[PDB]
Amino acid sequence: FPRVKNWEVGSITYDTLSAQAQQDGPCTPRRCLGSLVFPRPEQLLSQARDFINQYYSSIKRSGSQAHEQRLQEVEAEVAATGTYQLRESELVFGAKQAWRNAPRCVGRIQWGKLQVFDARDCRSAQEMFTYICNHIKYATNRGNLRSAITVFPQRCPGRGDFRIWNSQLVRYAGYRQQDGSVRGDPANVEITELCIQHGWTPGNGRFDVLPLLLQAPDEPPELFLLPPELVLEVPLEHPTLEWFAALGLRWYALPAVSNMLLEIGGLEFPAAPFSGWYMSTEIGTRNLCDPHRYNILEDVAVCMDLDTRTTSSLWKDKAAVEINVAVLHSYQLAKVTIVDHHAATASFMKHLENEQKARGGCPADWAWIVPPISGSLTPVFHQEMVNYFLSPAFRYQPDPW
Amino acid sequence: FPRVKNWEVGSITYDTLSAQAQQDGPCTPRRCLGSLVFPAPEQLLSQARDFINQYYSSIKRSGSQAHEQRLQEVEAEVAATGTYQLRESELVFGAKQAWRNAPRCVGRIQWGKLQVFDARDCRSAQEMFTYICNHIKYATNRGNLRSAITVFPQRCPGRGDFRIWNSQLVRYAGYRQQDGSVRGDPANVEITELCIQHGWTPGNGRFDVLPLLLQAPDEPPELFLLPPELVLEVPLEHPTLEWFAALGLRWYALPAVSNMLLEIGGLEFPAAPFSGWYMSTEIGTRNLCDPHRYNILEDVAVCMDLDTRTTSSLWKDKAAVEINVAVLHSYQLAKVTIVDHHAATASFMKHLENEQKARGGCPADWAWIVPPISGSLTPVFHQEMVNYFLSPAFRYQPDPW
Ligand code: HEM
Ligand code: HEM
Ligand SMILES: Cc1cc(N)nc2cc(-c3ccc4c(c3)[C@@H](N)CCCC4)ccc12
Ligand SMILES: Cc1cc(N)nc2cc(-c3ccc4c(c3)[C@@H](N)CCCC4)ccc12
Ligand SMILES: Cc1cc(N)nc2cc(-c3ccc4c(c3)[C@@H](N)CCCC4)ccc12
Ligand SMILES: Cc1cc(N)nc2cc(-c3ccc4c(c3)[C@@H](N)CCCC4)ccc12
Ligand SMILES: [Ca+2]
Ligand SMILES: [Cl-]
Ligand SMILES: [Cl-]
Ligand SMILES: [Gd]
Ligand SMILES: [Zn+2]
Ligand SMILES: [Zn+2]
Ligand SMILES: [Zn+2]
């Protein structure tokens, strides 16, 4: 039972939950690969039994009448057809636990309040689009954001797969130039090459919302324009640097991840888009300042008349904080839910203490929980953490091409 | 071999050196513990065998007459005496390799320019003190700092260890104040308690330099005062915040770690203090802002007339950036060597590139290489890293008391 210490306060806990870790990670006694982003058939019954055991233990109903009984139906379901369907409440519970079990997510203090839309009866790419648009409108909620996931039909043999080709539901275009370099978001250059390839005509701007590329089984992808008034966006202004707004920067409101594979009870949902709300450093520091992203940092520092001539002026650090201040200010003035990295990490500490008494520990990936600016100024920095894989879970998956 | 990617640039290397990892660390496929701070004749022979191999590799005489002769010499000496002695050239090579191999050190681009003082003929605590003072004088060099290590006699059978009780050669006292607070540095309350118990008359300021407690074999530790003019200090001022000088803050020029064990070819040196120069964030973020250290952040932010009632004003990040500006400015003004986290991480990337061509990889602890502020503004952030333990090496050891 690994001993975990908080070096800021002196407390010591022991992670007994790590004992249940199923799928194995990348690290070995010889070498640690914690920093890697992508870590390097009746088996279905075993994962089905375990998940059903979780559910009934969580409702204080372990080893009961209905517990035995539901063990039977799944045993018989797979016996007959080689797979099973989840009860409605089980799909809800599996979704919530998969969020609870996500080691890189700092927002898990919210894990209990998740809205699970059931799209398991989907059938076409036009159907997907209306399922996706009800999600986006419900999650957006005119700016008072609400966690939500939509669960499209699971995977089965013989049939293709439901897949969303965009990494997120809302993404900005990436256009190459007569010199390679990009107008718009360089992260999405590839999918923009496909959106054009499948019919979309590119805009000219740095903030053109990409069209969705939705894929019903076996039939190829199909483009879908997003409705403008459905995509809530925030123009960025600074509370006191009056020139900042003229930089023309905007970002959108809803972070909606649409390429991960929800895995519950041995079933695999390759299309299960989830959305919460942003931590402000995701926008200000990662999306806007990463050198391979919008890379605005030097442009903001010139407008502040900082000494960009030497690193020891900390010009990068100063411009980055102001970029973040403007993000916080703009989202608040637009009445759109956002949380700063100090509030977020403080709630995660609260989550760790809750998870300690409830389950005897919590899987956490230090390198992703600690924010990318001002790390040691947040209480998670001095907190040791254990990283392991519990189930249900969200996993990465190959691109559908 | 683990595939390692730099996400900023898209480079891809394969760390083949990790396969020679001469010991095992805390992680398993079940659980990563990378964030934890603290993770016989024939085996002495096999460690010695591998180091002699390393040494004769670095002087391009592998498998020569002089190489085989040296293996024969060492085995015969372990047979006659249970141990063996390093040649001077082997000691200099082994001390440089230990630095080169230290996975949490961002300043390793310097690893080859290290001044090695051989004090293995040291006799008493009093001589120990003389060697130390000359180390401090050579490394400080009136503010133009140089990298140095002084090596005291090795652990050997029949006699106790030389030990430096102090964690660093220069530390500020930490006195438990009356009500319950700490005046001075709180990390040093224990060593301060010991120094008093051993006859030190205690000051009562915030920046009182601690005496050294030096332990000769099978002797109690002995108290030595450092000559005031040996300890170069830097008063802290801010280039444009003139009330900052009124805080009375100071820091010392020389970081000299004195409580780690140096391991070379199976031999162990429990006393081998080493010194470099500071990276500014150790002083500004860690030493002054850590809430369990001097904890000046709120006092600074209040003086800046920031709004410290809501965290979304990023007052913490603003105040910390200005504390780092003052450290860099104060050290430059005093003509004392110092490096900022942007220049340091930039040279570490060159080190990674140099090391990949030389040994085919480089052990690095990502959570320690990334600075505690502005992490993703530095190029080491988006570089994946492999952590593992090579020897020669510096190791932690228990406190002698
Ligand atoms: C509601 C507030 C939420 C906040 C503030 C939040 C914040 C974050 C942040 C900052 C990251 C790390 C990104 C990075 O460091 O690059 C992350 C990752 C993640 N989030 Fe959350 N999140 C929230 C809700 C959710 C929800 C509702 C789900 C799923 C139902 C979820 C699932 C995940 C997963 C699986 C990851 C890890 C992705 C990966 O491993 O690549 N989060 N989140
Ligand atoms: C000359 C400039 C140097 C710089 C700028 C530097 C910088 C650093 C920093 C910033 C850390 C980690 C501290 C933290 O993250 O809180 C570190 C760790 C370390 N450094 Fe260096 N260092 C230098 C020289 C040296 C030398 C000369 C040696 C030994 C010969 C050395 C050996 C180590 C070791 C062993 C660690 C790990 C400490 C631990 O495991 O707790 N460094 N260094
Ligand atoms: C639900 C949610 C909320 C939020 N507020 N943020 C989130 C960020 C990610 C995320 C996951 C993986 C990757 C990224 C983001 C990338 N943006 C950074 C590394 C590449 C892989 C995923 C989900 C998030
Ligand atoms: C060590 C590390 C820690 C962390 N906390 N975050 C990290 C995020 C990336 C990363 C950054 C940007 C992008 C990606 C990964 C790609 N996965 C997605 C496409 C390009 C955008 C890489 C390394 C990271
Ligand atoms: C040579 C050197 C130079 C420098 N410029 N800095 C250095 C910082 C450390 C260091 C050593 C041990 C510990 C720390 C720092 C602390 N950060 C806490 C971790 C374990 C104890 C060690 C050596 C350093
Ligand atoms: C996860 C992690 C990463 C990192 N990069 N650094 C870390 C430094 C400490 C740490 C903080 C304060 C103190 C210590 C360690 C102890 N070593 C004693 C020295 C002062 C108190 C704890 C955790 C750290
Ligand atoms: Ca200028
Ligand atoms: Cl994003
Ligand atoms: Cl220090
Ligand atoms: Gd001023
Ligand atoms: Zn980034
Ligand atoms: Zn690991
Ligand atoms: Zn700290």
In whole angstroms, how far apart are CA A272 and each of A95, A256, B24?
10, 10, 40
Output the CA A367–ligand 11 centroid distance in Å.
Answer: 12
Q: Of B34, B37, B93, B43, which is closest to residue B264 (Cα–Cα)?
A: B93
On whether the CB atoms of residues A167 and A155 are closer than 8 A, the answer is no
Residue nearest to atom 9 of ligand 6 (CA): A382
Q: Of A269, A251, A267, which is closest to residue A259 (Cα–Cα)?
A: A269
In whole angstroms, how far apart are CA A100 and each of A106, A118, A371, B178, B385?
10, 19, 19, 45, 27
Q: Which chain A residue is nearest to residue B285, measuring alpha carbons?
A: A376
Interchain CB contact of A309 with B (< 8 Å)? no
Paired tokens of A224: 């879908």
Q: Of how many residues is chain B composed?
A: 401
- Which A positions 313-372 lie with beta carbon below 8 A of chain B? 313-314, 316-318, 320-321, 324-325, 328, 332, 340, 342-343, 365-367, 370, 372
CA distance linking residue A303 with residue A282, whole number of Å: 22
Q: Which atom of ligand 5 is nearest to the CA of B279?
A: 5
> Looking up tokens 């701007």, which residue turns up?
A205
- Partners of B29 on chain A (C-beta within 8 Å) are 24-28
Per CATH, the homologous superfamily of domain A15-120+147-157+261-275+345-369 is Nitric Oxide Synthase; Chain A, domain 1 (3.90.340.10)
> Is residue B381 marked as binding?
yes
CA distance linking residue A339 with residue A19, whole number of Å: 33
Provide the sign of the torsion angle of the four alpha carbons B194, B200, B203, B208, taken in this order: negative
Cis peptide before B392 (omega within 30 of 0): yes
* Beta carbons within 8 Å of A208's beta carbon, 6+ residues apart: A172, A173, A184, A202
Interchain CB contact of B385 with A (< 8 Å)? yes
Residue A210 distance to chain B (closest CA, Å)? 23
Paired tokens of B343: 């220049």
For residue A346, count CB atoms less than 10 angstroms from its CB and return exposed for 0-12, middle for 13-18, buried for 19 or more. middle
On whether the CB atoms of residues B118 and B91 are closer than 8 A, the answer is yes
* Beta carbons within 8 Å of B393's beta carbon, 6+ residues apart: B98, B101, B102, B262, B263
On whether the CB atoms of residues A323 and A285 are closer than 8 A, the answer is yes
Distance of CA A164 to the CA centre of its chain: 14
What letter represents residue B395's amino acid?
Answer: R
For A192, the 3-state DSSP assignment is: helix
Provide the sign of the torsion angle of the four alpha carbons B68, B272, B150, B118, taken in this order: negative
On whether the CB atoms of residues B349 and B382 are closer than 8 A, the answer is no
Return the number of other C-beta atoms located less than 10 Å from residue A387's C-beta: 24
Cross-strand pairs, B383: B6
* Beta carbons within 8 Å of B283's beta carbon, 6+ residues apart: B251, B327
Torsion of CA A185, A189, A191, A193, to 10 degrees: 130
On whether the CB atoms of residues B84 and B262 are closer than 8 A, the answer is no
Query: Would you kindly state where each structural domain of chain A is located, as residue ranges?
Result: 15-120+147-157+261-275+345-369, 121-146+161-232+396-400, 233-255+278-343
CA distance linking residue B155 with residue B132, whole number of Å: 19
- Write the DSSP assignment of A301-313 as a string of letters: HHHTT--TT-GGG
Q: Which atom of ligand 4 is nearest to the CA of A368?
A: 5
Ramachandran class of A36: left when φ > 0, alpha when ψ lies in -120 to 50, beta otherwise: beta
Return the exposure string of A131-170: e unless at least 16 CB atoms fall within 10 Å of the residue's CB, then b: bbbebbeebbeebebbbbbbbbbbbeeeeebbbbbbbbbb
Residue B142: phi, psi to the nearest 5? Answer: 60, 30
Pocket lining: A105 vs ligand 1, CB cutoff 6 Å: yes
Edge-first strand order for the sheet with A148-151 is: A115-118, A148-151, A274-275, A256-257
Helix or strand run (H / E) with residue A118 = strand A115-118
Q: Are strands B267-269 and A182-184 parallel, antiparallel or unpaired?
A: unpaired
Interchain CB contact of B297 with A (< 8 Å)? yes
Provide the sign of the torsion angle of the four alpha carbons B334, B339, B340, B343, taken in this order: positive
- After which residues, if any, is chain B broken (C to N > 2.5 Å)? 39
Residue A390: phi, psi to the nearest 5? Answer: -105, 170
Edge-first strand order for the sheet with B274-275 is: B115-118, B148-151, B274-275, B256-257
Distance of CA A114 to the CA centre of its chain: 13
From B282, B303, B359, B384, the catalytic residue: B282
Q: Of A38, A32, A1, A31, which is closest to residue A16 (Cα–Cα)?
A: A1
CA distance linking residue A229 with residue A237, whole number of Å: 21
Half-sphere exposure for B394 (CA within 13 Å, toward CB): 22
In whole angstroms, how far apart are CA B318 and each of B229, B289, B308, B323?
35, 12, 11, 9
Q: Residue B231 has what DSSP assignment?
A: S
In whole angstroms, how far apart are CA B273 and each of A100, A167, B193, B198?
46, 51, 22, 22
> Is residue B168 marked as binding?
yes
On whether the CB atoms of residues B139 and B147 are closer than 8 A, the answer is yes
Helix then strand count (H, E) for chain B reads 10, 16
Interchain CB contact of B8 with A (< 8 Å)? yes
Q: Do domains A15-120+147-157+261-275+345-369 and A121-146+161-232+396-400 have the same CATH topology?
A: no
For B323, the 3-state DSSP assignment is: helix
Q: Of how many residues is chain A composed?
A: 401
Inter-chain touch B321–A321, beta carbons under 8 Å: yes
CA distance linking residue A176 with residue A193, whole number of Å: 9
On whether the CB atoms of residues B151 and B267 are closer than 8 A, the answer is no
Fold held by B233-255+278-343: 3.90.1230
Per CATH, the homologous superfamily of domain B121-146+161-232+396-400 is Nitric Oxide Synthase;Heme Domain;Chain A domain 2 (3.90.440.10)
Q: Which chain B residue is nearest to residue A8, measuring alpha carbons?
A: B292
Q: Of A177, A135, A317, A358, which is closest to residue B319 (Cα–Cα)?
A: A317
In whole angstroms, how far apart are CA B374 and each of A301, A320, B317?
15, 8, 10
Paired tokens of B36: 């934890």
Cross-strand pairs, B113: none
